[PDB]
Amino acid sequence: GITRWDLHKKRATGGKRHIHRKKRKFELGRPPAATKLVHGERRVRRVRTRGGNRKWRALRLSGGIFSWGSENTAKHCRILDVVYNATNNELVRTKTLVKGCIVQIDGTPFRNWYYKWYGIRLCNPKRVYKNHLRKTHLRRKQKGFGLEEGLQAQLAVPVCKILARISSRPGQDGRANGYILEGKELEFYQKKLDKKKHK
Amino acid sequence: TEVELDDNAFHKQDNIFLAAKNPSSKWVAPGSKGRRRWWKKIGLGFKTPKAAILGTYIDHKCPFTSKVSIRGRILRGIIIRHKMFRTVVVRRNYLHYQKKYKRYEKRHKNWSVHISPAFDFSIGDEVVFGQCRPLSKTVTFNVLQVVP
Amino acid sequence: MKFNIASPQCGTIKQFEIDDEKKLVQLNDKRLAQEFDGEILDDKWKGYVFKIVGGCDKQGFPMKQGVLVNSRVKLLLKGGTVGCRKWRVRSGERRRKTIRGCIVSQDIALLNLKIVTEGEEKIEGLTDTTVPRRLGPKRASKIRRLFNLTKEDDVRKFVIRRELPAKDNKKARSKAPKIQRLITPAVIRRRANKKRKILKKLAQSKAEREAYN
Amino acid sequence: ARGPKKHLKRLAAPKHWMMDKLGGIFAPKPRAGPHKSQQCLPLILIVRNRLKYALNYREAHMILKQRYVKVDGKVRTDIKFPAGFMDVIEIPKTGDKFRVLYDTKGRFILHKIKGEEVDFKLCKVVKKGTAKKETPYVVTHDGRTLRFPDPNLKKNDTVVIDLKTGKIKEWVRFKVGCLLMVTSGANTGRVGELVNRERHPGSFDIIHLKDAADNKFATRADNVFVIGSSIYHPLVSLPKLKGVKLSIVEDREKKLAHNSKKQKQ
RNA sequence: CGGUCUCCUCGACUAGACGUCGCUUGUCCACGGACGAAAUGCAGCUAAGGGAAGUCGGCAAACUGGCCGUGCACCUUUGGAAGAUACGGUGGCUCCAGAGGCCAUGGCUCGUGUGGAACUGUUGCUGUGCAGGGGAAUCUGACUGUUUAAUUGAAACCCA
RNA sequence: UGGCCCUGGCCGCAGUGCUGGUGGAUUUCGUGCAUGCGCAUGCCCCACUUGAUCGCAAGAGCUUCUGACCUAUCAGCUUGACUGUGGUGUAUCGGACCACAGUGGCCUUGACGGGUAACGGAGAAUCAGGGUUCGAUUCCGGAGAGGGAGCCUGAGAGACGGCUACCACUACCAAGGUGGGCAGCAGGCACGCAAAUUGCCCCAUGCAAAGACAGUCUGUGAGGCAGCGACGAACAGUA
RNA sequence: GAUCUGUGAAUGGCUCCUUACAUCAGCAGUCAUCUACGUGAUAGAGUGUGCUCGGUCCACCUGCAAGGACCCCAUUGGACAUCCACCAAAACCUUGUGGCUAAUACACGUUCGACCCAGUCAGCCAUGCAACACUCGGCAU
């Protein structure tokens, strides 16, 4: 079947290699998952692997755990759409989820979370506890606090569409986890989106 | 030169989180401008280039600023040519002793070796390169020292 | 055409022969496993309903349910499936075997039927005789299920026996089964031993870690 | 079709078992137990070939499955259990008590010992790790774990474990001056105190040992075995030659004298 | 229905002064009409199965046909042979790349000129007109050119 | 450390329970022992076994460096070809595969091609020395199971005394259907200058299994022993 | 005996067709990996929010900040085998059906196997500068 060996791949010189064995199972490959972004249901097929272990082909994922690195938050956030891919636009067009692809995610969590945690409302909406007031103002007065101008401009629209990058390998663990872009990577990919919106 | 990369992706270093609120001074280097950089000191009697420690380039397959571990043979060759990107051809002219005729032959072996952007080198300079995991079809060695 | 007709309520099975085409040809779209009336192929079977559960054909091939054709189809078949046999297929192999579809036709030599509804009069082979069940329930919970027992009195008294009379050279044997899933005070002490030793080992390891700290 | 091989030919058998090349095509392939297959004695070899209770393979199986051959303070019924170096083998019905050691020629001898010598064992630390829940452990050459060692017990040290409890009773450092035994290479079975350790980062360090009399040899640091804080306190009983290898002319003269004085009667 | 000098010469498809259709201009004039309109004929087409068995002779007709990509043998005067032979594709739609210019890296103009991909269709697309069948030899004239207006175009004449 | 939200919604992050297991033994009171005087405290079966984790061991896969025969009547070879970035896939690294970039990579120190009186090595025969020739064959490694290819099961197979298909031959048939795989051991036909018994047995050596032996026959054409055997060796007789 | 289940049949035996840095030999790496049997250790899952929330029984008001009564623990379920019976086929190491009956098969289930601590939520106390910020309460800044 799909073999990931190099007995067919010619020598580094350019000389042909004469194969004198047939394909061993320990060097097989399996067809790509090509995880599609699908609004709704998740599909995950378990795959029996070299030691009887499991891999998890994600077919048709919908969302996943997305982390706010500076904030240590990690909410499950319902991927909206694949916006950018590093090299080929065919995966962006057909909405294929692969690691290191850039996606718009819901982000109404990390907003309700930001409120619950800091007591800070990021958009004008469109009992009260003494200990909660105390703790929210403490977490406000901590040192590294402050929401950056590229993240709050996103969390301040009434329909949040925050830019995350997918970190898991969905065809291997069946997950579309990722991290929200922060700072210079956010600026990079926002600039790419600008370029292809204008050109 | 080869610090340049593609502009299709945002090349970051693996073990450095660029958006840390209160980062530590563990990777603040003693000659940098506050720029944090993960690096290691491969430890077979080699020195981590100041270019690697204080540089800005991003390189996986670099033995000093990436997860690539130097283990196995460590050979010495000459840079034949540098016509690939971050890869370089290295030659080892050695002498193989024929037993019957009690003499030697001139033989050679080429190697597609991986030069990190931490090394200044001209064509013809000597190189010590150590073995790493396979980085490509023919590349399985990284350049650990350039000798003028 | 031979019909293996089985009455489960009596627990018996009996074969019959029919060669009247006027009766046979009503069974030409009767897909497998669907009830039909006995009045269609016999007049002394009225009010009876036969579920056509299985079938063979000429040349002897089975009638695989769910194929939805009336000819032969060769198929990859795992063991134990209708058409292949589990004890012939080497612990995980599938064999390509020949089998007929579930649609009935005039290529069917044998039809396995089972009565679901009984009729007015009584069939001389099937329903005139009832066949007793060989064995009683062997596991404690099934014995309780049978004899309306609650867990305060035992099943060891209510276990059904099998009396074989004193045949040649041998006295009367009262054979009973070893009750399975039965909990004895011995079993309780065994499980308590296991659990207590496990907990003592956990305590050993906690004490070791605390002493190291 | 290939998986793990189950057989060991008699020719491909470890030479330190004096397997006769004509007495069968196969040799009992050791199981994957505590010791390495080329540094171990199968219990069948200890029971049939050395201590000839078992006249053959069948009687070896019998003796062993009757659950009275005890190896390291517990019964081992596998006829192919790889009993290795410094293991204690007791046969209570016979009152036999051996520690399996190396003779100066590099073969496994069964050195007869006494009570305290059988009630503990001596095992070298080869790896030092941490398991989940922050559990520092030290893997030894008998493959055992010792899930909570003293913090100041670095790698190449040796340990005295009590075969009853299976915990650590003592340990001996690998610093220069310790009494030491060789367990592989040409110099295996020789005892000599540590003199100096040449470092070779990235490769094998070398250990220079001074024999009991005055000879000097060298070997590898993963080839040495600590037995004793010094040549005055060996942590275990030691065989007849006490680890002092003779020259080959000395050995030939010794054999000749033995044969002659035996024929004298 | 032959021949006869020159000038101007639109739009669409297209490489186009080919070929097909249309605005401007001009014209419906050629002896007509009925009857589905025999046989025969002169023209246009088809034809199962076979495939030159027809015939002096594959005559006549048919096959092929544009473009793009890959590629191409013997022989050779080294120029050719060659479009050798041969293989694949070709629509529609939605996109992705891709070249330039002007005003002042934004406004505007901006590849009917190319490559890729997705979808799509009863596999079909140079969809019509148009549009090489190919290969292997012998004789012969080197070639190109010339020729008996009105039965011979040739191996004849001429040429270098 | 974070990966539930404001009453439904969303997740459902898949998994891990020393078995809802088995045998033998047997006295299971919570206070029996005792202390201090029943009150308070330490104890009140042994093994086997399904499974999870971490090592080790035993293996495997991949990878490193150096080292192979003749041939120029083979001088240029290569276009996933060589590197890179981002992914995919895998048990894992990797152009192994893909998308986008670049134009590399090897070569008279013989590349690429062709040949096989090519499986490789340990080794064998000679050998003053230096060397020459061979190595199908017992040990190790590789490959294969009629030619190909694809798989399932499983820890492990691209398995063939497993399956599936095509090809080449082929066996049975009641003509609808069913099959085949000796380069395992014997044996047969061919082919040839050219090579053995359709034997007995697990006694030894080992291996496997739910398995010491016996009551009560584990299997083993591995392996052993015999038969045939002027291959080839050693020792004797024919006085 | 049989049968289901487990486990083995991937080892061994044969052959040398292929194969020219390929195989292989020695050396080395896995800090790029997999692992049944073997062995040494290990193992505390009522657990998506502090609670409501393991299951029932009451409360209050778009829930609460201190509120309760019991129950779980003598251990689950449904099959299909061997078996009986009727059998299709010329056969086939081909095969159907009906009725029982097992589990270390399969499914399913898990309180007492913890305790404490961190953490999360809420409340309260003692004491202190201060009229600055953001607000709950009243009005169209």
mmCIF file with all atom_site columns, N, CA and C (backbone and C1' of nucleotides) in Angstrom, chain E residues 27-46:
data_model
loop_
_atom_site.group_PDB
_atom_site.id
_atom_site.type_symbol
_atom_site.label_atom_id
_atom_site.label_alt_id
_atom_site.label_comp_id
_atom_site.label_asym_id
_atom_site.label_entity_id
_atom_site.label_seq_id
_atom_site.pdbx_PDB_ins_code
_atom_site.Cartn_x
_atom_site.Cartn_y
_atom_site.Cartn_z
_atom_site.occupancy
_atom_site.B_iso_or_equiv
_atom_site.pdbx_formal_charge
_atom_site.auth_seq_id
_atom_site.auth_comp_id
_atom_site.auth_asym_id
_atom_site.auth_atom_id
_atom_site.pdbx_PDB_model_num
ATOM 1   P P     . U E 1 27 ? -31.367 47.027 -56.407 1.00 0.00 ? 27 U E P     1
ATOM 2   O "O5'" . U E 1 27 ? -31.509 45.443 -56.375 1.00 0.00 ? 27 U E "O5'" 1
ATOM 3   C "C5'" . U E 1 27 ? -31.026 44.653 -57.451 1.00 0.00 ? 27 U E "C5'" 1
ATOM 4   C "C4'" . U E 1 27 ? -31.009 43.185 -57.109 1.00 0.00 ? 27 U E "C4'" 1
ATOM 5   C "C3'" . U E 1 27 ? -32.357 42.512 -56.942 1.00 0.00 ? 27 U E "C3'" 1
ATOM 6   O "O3'" . U E 1 27 ? -32.989 42.205 -58.170 1.00 0.00 ? 27 U E "O3'" 1
ATOM 7   C "C1'" . U E 1 27 ? -30.958 41.875 -55.170 1.00 0.00 ? 27 U E "C1'" 1
ATOM 8   P P     . C E 1 28 ? -34.587 42.134 -58.241 1.00 0.00 ? 28 C E P     1
ATOM 9   O "O5'" . C E 1 28 ? -34.935 40.714 -57.618 1.00 0.00 ? 28 C E "O5'" 1
ATOM 10  C "C5'" . C E 1 28 ? -34.590 39.521 -58.296 1.00 0.00 ? 28 C E "C5'" 1
ATOM 11  C "C4'" . C E 1 28 ? -34.876 38.305 -57.456 1.00 0.00 ? 28 C E "C4'" 1
ATOM 12  C "C3'" . C E 1 28 ? -36.334 38.044 -57.119 1.00 0.00 ? 28 C E "C3'" 1
ATOM 13  O "O3'" . C E 1 28 ? -37.026 37.381 -58.161 1.00 0.00 ? 28 C E "O3'" 1
ATOM 14  C "C1'" . C E 1 28 ? -35.013 37.813 -55.176 1.00 0.00 ? 28 C E "C1'" 1
ATOM 15  P P     . C E 1 29 ? -37.877 38.201 -59.246 1.00 0.00 ? 29 C E P     1
ATOM 16  O "O5'" . C E 1 29 ? -37.135 37.870 -60.611 1.00 0.00 ? 29 C E "O5'" 1
ATOM 17  C "C5'" . C E 1 29 ? -36.577 38.902 -61.405 1.00 0.00 ? 29 C E "C5'" 1
ATOM 18  C "C4'" . C E 1 29 ? -35.342 38.435 -62.130 1.00 0.00 ? 29 C E "C4'" 1
ATOM 19  C "C3'" . C E 1 29 ? -35.375 37.010 -62.640 1.00 0.00 ? 29 C E "C3'" 1
ATOM 20  O "O3'" . C E 1 29 ? -36.078 36.892 -63.860 1.00 0.00 ? 29 C E "O3'" 1
ATOM 21  C "C1'" . C E 1 29 ? -33.301 37.434 -61.575 1.00 0.00 ? 29 C E "C1'" 1
ATOM 22  P P     . A E 1 30 ? -36.908 35.562 -64.197 1.00 0.00 ? 30 A E P     1
ATOM 23  O "O5'" . A E 1 30 ? -36.136 34.412 -63.412 1.00 0.00 ? 30 A E "O5'" 1
ATOM 24  C "C5'" . A E 1 30 ? -35.787 33.191 -64.052 1.00 0.00 ? 30 A E "C5'" 1
ATOM 25  C "C4'" . A E 1 30 ? -34.468 33.290 -64.779 1.00 0.00 ? 30 A E "C4'" 1
ATOM 26  C "C3'" . A E 1 30 ? -33.950 31.974 -65.351 1.00 0.00 ? 30 A E "C3'" 1
ATOM 27  O "O3'" . A E 1 30 ? -33.406 32.159 -66.652 1.00 0.00 ? 30 A E "O3'" 1
ATOM 28  C "C1'" . A E 1 30 ? -32.321 32.925 -63.922 1.00 0.00 ? 30 A E "C1'" 1
ATOM 29  P P     . C E 1 31 ? -33.746 31.058 -67.762 1.00 0.00 ? 31 C E P     1
ATOM 30  O "O5'" . C E 1 31 ? -34.796 30.137 -67.004 1.00 0.00 ? 31 C E "O5'" 1
ATOM 31  C "C5'" . C E 1 31 ? -35.826 29.469 -67.704 1.00 0.00 ? 31 C E "C5'" 1
ATOM 32  C "C4'" . C E 1 31 ? -37.186 29.932 -67.259 1.00 0.00 ? 31 C E "C4'" 1
ATOM 33  C "C3'" . C E 1 31 ? -37.760 29.279 -66.019 1.00 0.00 ? 31 C E "C3'" 1
ATOM 34  O "O3'" . C E 1 31 ? -37.248 29.799 -64.808 1.00 0.00 ? 31 C E "O3'" 1
ATOM 35  C "C1'" . C E 1 31 ? -39.400 29.327 -67.705 1.00 0.00 ? 31 C E "C1'" 1
ATOM 36  P P     . G E 1 32 ? -37.376 28.930 -63.470 1.00 0.00 ? 32 G E P     1
ATOM 37  O "O5'" . G E 1 32 ? -38.839 29.258 -62.945 1.00 0.00 ? 32 G E "O5'" 1
ATOM 38  C "C5'" . G E 1 32 ? -39.704 28.228 -62.498 1.00 0.00 ? 32 G E "C5'" 1
ATOM 39  C "C4'" . G E 1 32 ? -41.153 28.612 -62.671 1.00 0.00 ? 32 G E "C4'" 1
ATOM 40  C "C3'" . G E 1 32 ? -42.162 27.730 -61.961 1.00 0.00 ? 32 G E "C3'" 1
ATOM 41  O "O3'" . G E 1 32 ? -42.304 28.022 -60.586 1.00 0.00 ? 32 G E "O3'" 1
ATOM 42  C "C1'" . G E 1 32 ? -42.846 28.019 -64.181 1.00 0.00 ? 32 G E "C1'" 1
ATOM 43  P P     . G E 1 33 ? -42.675 26.846 -59.565 1.00 0.00 ? 33 G E P     1
ATOM 44  O "O5'" . G E 1 33 ? -44.122 26.384 -60.030 1.00 0.00 ? 33 G E "O5'" 1
ATOM 45  C "C5'" . G E 1 33 ? -45.266 27.162 -59.727 1.00 0.00 ? 33 G E "C5'" 1
ATOM 46  C "C4'" . G E 1 33 ? -46.531 26.405 -60.026 1.00 0.00 ? 33 G E "C4'" 1
ATOM 47  C "C3'" . G E 1 33 ? -46.680 25.067 -59.330 1.00 0.00 ? 33 G E "C3'" 1
ATOM 48  O "O3'" . G E 1 33 ? -47.138 25.172 -57.998 1.00 0.00 ? 33 G E "O3'" 1
ATOM 49  C "C1'" . G E 1 33 ? -47.123 24.786 -61.608 1.00 0.00 ? 33 G E "C1'" 1
ATOM 50  P P     . A E 1 34 ? -46.657 24.106 -56.905 1.00 0.00 ? 34 A E P     1
ATOM 51  O "O5'" . A E 1 34 ? -47.589 22.845 -57.156 1.00 0.00 ? 34 A E "O5'" 1
ATOM 52  C "C5'" . A E 1 34 ? -48.990 22.934 -56.967 1.00 0.00 ? 34 A E "C5'" 1
ATOM 53  C "C4'" . A E 1 34 ? -49.721 21.856 -57.722 1.00 0.00 ? 34 A E "C4'" 1
ATOM 54  C "C3'" . A E 1 34 ? -49.587 20.449 -57.179 1.00 0.00 ? 34 A E "C3'" 1
ATOM 55  O "O3'" . A E 1 34 ? -50.447 20.203 -56.083 1.00 0.00 ? 34 A E "O3'" 1
ATOM 56  C "C1'" . A E 1 34 ? -49.292 20.429 -59.520 1.00 0.00 ? 34 A E "C1'" 1
ATOM 57  P P     . C E 1 35 ? -49.946 19.300 -54.857 1.00 0.00 ? 35 C E P     1
ATOM 58  O "O5'" . C E 1 35 ? -49.676 17.882 -55.518 1.00 0.00 ? 35 C E "O5'" 1
ATOM 59  C "C5'" . C E 1 35 ? -50.743 17.083 -55.997 1.00 0.00 ? 35 C E "C5'" 1
ATOM 60  C "C4'" . C E 1 35 ? -50.223 15.801 -56.588 1.00 0.00 ? 35 C E "C4'" 1
ATOM 61  C "C3'" . C E 1 35 ? -49.286 15.008 -55.697 1.00 0.00 ? 35 C E "C3'" 1
ATOM 62  O "O3'" . C E 1 35 ? -49.992 14.204 -54.774 1.00 0.00 ? 35 C E "O3'" 1
ATOM 63  C "C1'" . C E 1 35 ? -48.375 15.170 -57.878 1.00 0.00 ? 35 C E "C1'" 1
ATOM 64  P P     . G E 1 36 ? -49.388 13.899 -53.322 1.00 0.00 ? 36 G E P     1
ATOM 65  O "O5'" . G E 1 36 ? -48.436 12.654 -53.569 1.00 0.00 ? 36 G E "O5'" 1
ATOM 66  C "C5'" . G E 1 36 ? -47.712 12.061 -52.500 1.00 0.00 ? 36 G E "C5'" 1
ATOM 67  C "C4'" . G E 1 36 ? -46.302 11.732 -52.913 1.00 0.00 ? 36 G E "C4'" 1
ATOM 68  C "C3'" . G E 1 36 ? -45.510 10.898 -51.916 1.00 0.00 ? 36 G E "C3'" 1
ATOM 69  O "O3'" . G E 1 36 ? -44.554 10.097 -52.614 1.00 0.00 ? 36 G E "O3'" 1
ATOM 70  C "C1'" . G E 1 36 ? -44.426 12.949 -52.238 1.00 0.00 ? 36 G E "C1'" 1
ATOM 71  P P     . A E 1 37 ? -44.917 9.310  -53.970 1.00 0.00 ? 37 A E P     1
ATOM 72  O "O5'" . A E 1 37 ? -44.666 10.382 -55.119 1.00 0.00 ? 37 A E "O5'" 1
ATOM 73  C "C5'" . A E 1 37 ? -44.596 10.002 -56.488 1.00 0.00 ? 37 A E "C5'" 1
ATOM 74  C "C4'" . A E 1 37 ? -43.475 10.708 -57.212 1.00 0.00 ? 37 A E "C4'" 1
ATOM 75  C "C3'" . A E 1 37 ? -42.103 10.603 -56.555 1.00 0.00 ? 37 A E "C3'" 1
ATOM 76  O "O3'" . A E 1 37 ? -41.102 10.557 -57.566 1.00 0.00 ? 37 A E "O3'" 1
ATOM 77  C "C1'" . A E 1 37 ? -42.708 12.874 -56.747 1.00 0.00 ? 37 A E "C1'" 1
ATOM 78  P P     . A E 1 38 ? -40.195 9.252  -57.747 1.00 0.00 ? 38 A E P     1
ATOM 79  O "O5'" . A E 1 38 ? -41.113 8.258  -58.575 1.00 0.00 ? 38 A E "O5'" 1
ATOM 80  C "C5'" . A E 1 38 ? -41.907 7.292  -57.909 1.00 0.00 ? 38 A E "C5'" 1
ATOM 81  C "C4'" . A E 1 38 ? -42.050 6.032  -58.719 1.00 0.00 ? 38 A E "C4'" 1
ATOM 82  C "C3'" . A E 1 38 ? -40.768 5.426  -59.254 1.00 0.00 ? 38 A E "C3'" 1
ATOM 83  O "O3'" . A E 1 38 ? -40.080 4.668  -58.275 1.00 0.00 ? 38 A E "O3'" 1
ATOM 84  C "C1'" . A E 1 38 ? -42.415 5.446  -60.950 1.00 0.00 ? 38 A E "C1'" 1
ATOM 85  P P     . A E 1 39 ? -38.475 4.633  -58.233 1.00 0.00 ? 39 A E P     1
ATOM 86  O "O5'" . A E 1 39 ? -38.057 3.971  -59.615 1.00 0.00 ? 39 A E "O5'" 1
ATOM 87  C "C5'" . A E 1 39 ? -38.333 2.608  -59.885 1.00 0.00 ? 39 A E "C5'" 1
ATOM 88  C "C4'" . A E 1 39 ? -37.968 2.250  -61.300 1.00 0.00 ? 39 A E "C4'" 1
ATOM 89  C "C3'" . A E 1 39 ? -36.541 2.551  -61.711 1.00 0.00 ? 39 A E "C3'" 1
ATOM 90  O "O3'" . A E 1 39 ? -35.630 1.562  -61.281 1.00 0.00 ? 39 A E "O3'" 1
ATOM 91  C "C1'" . A E 1 39 ? -38.019 3.296  -63.388 1.00 0.00 ? 39 A E "C1'" 1
ATOM 92  C "C1'" . U E 1 40 ? -33.330 5.204  -64.771 1.00 0.00 ? 40 U E "C1'" 1
ATOM 93  C "C3'" . U E 1 40 ? -31.641 4.102  -63.585 1.00 0.00 ? 40 U E "C3'" 1
ATOM 94  C "C4'" . U E 1 40 ? -32.697 3.097  -63.986 1.00 0.00 ? 40 U E "C4'" 1
ATOM 95  O "O3'" . U E 1 40 ? -30.338 3.566  -63.502 1.00 0.00 ? 40 U E "O3'" 1
ATOM 96  C "C5'" . U E 1 40 ? -33.117 2.110  -62.931 1.00 0.00 ? 40 U E "C5'" 1
ATOM 97  O "O5'" . U E 1 40 ? -33.478 2.762  -61.726 1.00 0.00 ? 40 U E "O5'" 1
ATOM 98  P P     . U E 1 40 ? -34.256 1.987  -60.580 1.00 0.00 ? 40 U E P     1
ATOM 99  P P     . G E 1 41 ? -29.346 4.106  -62.368 1.00 0.00 ? 41 G E P     1
ATOM 100 O "O5'" . G E 1 41 ? -29.029 5.598  -62.818 1.00 0.00 ? 41 G E "O5'" 1
ATOM 101 C "C5'" . G E 1 41 ? -28.553 5.866  -64.125 1.00 0.00 ? 41 G E "C5'" 1
ATOM 102 C "C4'" . G E 1 41 ? -28.663 7.322  -64.493 1.00 0.00 ? 41 G E "C4'" 1
ATOM 103 C "C3'" . G E 1 41 ? -27.833 8.288  -63.672 1.00 0.00 ? 41 G E "C3'" 1
ATOM 104 O "O3'" . G E 1 41 ? -26.484 8.316  -64.096 1.00 0.00 ? 41 G E "O3'" 1
ATOM 105 C "C1'" . G E 1 41 ? -30.013 9.162  -64.004 1.00 0.00 ? 41 G E "C1'" 1
ATOM 106 C "C1'" . C E 1 42 ? -26.762 13.249 -62.103 1.00 0.00 ? 42 C E "C1'" 1
ATOM 107 C "C3'" . C E 1 42 ? -24.512 12.575 -62.055 1.00 0.00 ? 42 C E "C3'" 1
ATOM 108 C "C4'" . C E 1 42 ? -25.115 12.186 -63.389 1.00 0.00 ? 42 C E "C4'" 1
ATOM 109 O "O3'" . C E 1 42 ? -23.137 12.897 -62.143 1.00 0.00 ? 42 C E "O3'" 1
ATOM 110 C "C5'" . C E 1 42 ? -24.851 10.776 -63.831 1.00 0.00 ? 42 C E "C5'" 1
ATOM 111 O "O5'" . C E 1 42 ? -25.040 9.873  -62.759 1.00 0.00 ? 42 C E "O5'" 1
ATOM 112 P P     . C E 1 42 ? -25.287 8.330  -63.029 1.00 0.00 ? 42 C E P     1
ATOM 113 P P     . A E 1 43 ? -22.197 12.750 -60.854 1.00 0.00 ? 43 A E P     1
ATOM 114 O "O5'" . A E 1 43 ? -23.023 13.542 -59.686 1.00 0.00 ? 43 A E "O5'" 1
ATOM 115 C "C5'" . A E 1 43 ? -22.465 13.771 -58.439 1.00 0.00 ? 43 A E "C5'" 1
ATOM 116 C "C4'" . A E 1 43 ? -23.343 14.853 -57.769 1.00 0.00 ? 43 A E "C4'" 1
ATOM 117 C "C3'" . A E 1 43 ? -23.501 14.521 -56.287 1.00 0.00 ? 43 A E "C3'" 1
ATOM 118 O "O3'" . A E 1 43 ? -22.423 14.942 -55.588 1.00 0.00 ? 43 A E "O3'" 1
ATOM 119 C "C1'" . A E 1 43 ? -25.551 15.000 -56.944 1.00 0.00 ? 43 A E "C1'" 1
ATOM 120 P P     . G E 1 44 ? -21.709 13.939 -54.564 1.00 0.00 ? 44 G E P     1
ATOM 121 O "O5'" . G E 1 44 ? -22.444 14.228 -53.187 1.00 0.00 ? 44 G E "O5'" 1
ATOM 122 C "C5'" . G E 1 44 ? -22.898 15.532 -52.863 1.00 0.00 ? 44 G E "C5'" 1
ATOM 123 C "C4'" . G E 1 44 ? -23.778 15.506 -51.644 1.00 0.00 ? 44 G E "C4'" 1
ATOM 124 C "C3'" . G E 1 44 ? -23.385 14.497 -50.583 1.00 0.00 ? 44 G E "C3'" 1
ATOM 125 O "O3'" . G E 1 44 ? -22.323 14.943 -49.765 1.00 0.00 ? 44 G E "O3'" 1
ATOM 126 C "C1'" . G E 1 44 ? -25.713 14.392 -50.955 1.00 0.00 ? 44 G E "C1'" 1
ATOM 127 P P     . C E 1 45 ? -21.326 13.871 -49.114 1.00 0.00 ? 45 C E P     1
ATOM 128 O "O5'" . C E 1 45 ? -22.073 13.433 -47.785 1.00 0.00 ? 45 C E "O5'" 1
ATOM 129 C "C5'" . C E 1 45 ? -22.380 12.071 -47.556 1.00 0.00 ? 45 C E "C5'" 1
ATOM 130 C "C4'" . C E 1 45 ? -23.697 11.911 -46.843 1.00 0.00 ? 45 C E "C4'" 1
ATOM 131 C "C3'" . C E 1 45 ? -23.818 10.657 -46.001 1.00 0.00 ? 45 C E "C3'" 1
ATOM 132 O "O3'" . C E 1 45 ? -23.248 10.827 -44.723 1.00 0.00 ? 45 C E "O3'" 1
ATOM 133 C "C1'" . C E 1 45 ? -25.738 10.884 -47.353 1.00 0.00 ? 45 C E "C1'" 1
ATOM 134 P P     . U E 1 46 ? -21.866 10.112 -44.361 1.00 0.00 ? 46 U E P     1
ATOM 135 O "O5'" . U E 1 46 ? -22.309 8.964  -43.359 1.00 0.00 ? 46 U E "O5'" 1
ATOM 136 C "C5'" . U E 1 46 ? -22.717 7.703  -43.857 1.00 0.00 ? 46 U E "C5'" 1
ATOM 137 C "C4'" . U E 1 46 ? -24.070 7.293  -43.336 1.00 0.00 ? 46 U E "C4'" 1
ATOM 138 C "C3'" . U E 1 46 ? -24.229 5.800  -43.117 1.00 0.00 ? 46 U E "C3'" 1
ATOM 139 O "O3'" . U E 1 46 ? -23.732 5.374  -41.866 1.00 0.00 ? 46 U E "O3'" 1
ATOM 140 C "C1'" . U E 1 46 ? -26.009 6.559  -44.433 1.00 0.00 ? 46 U E "C1'" 1
#
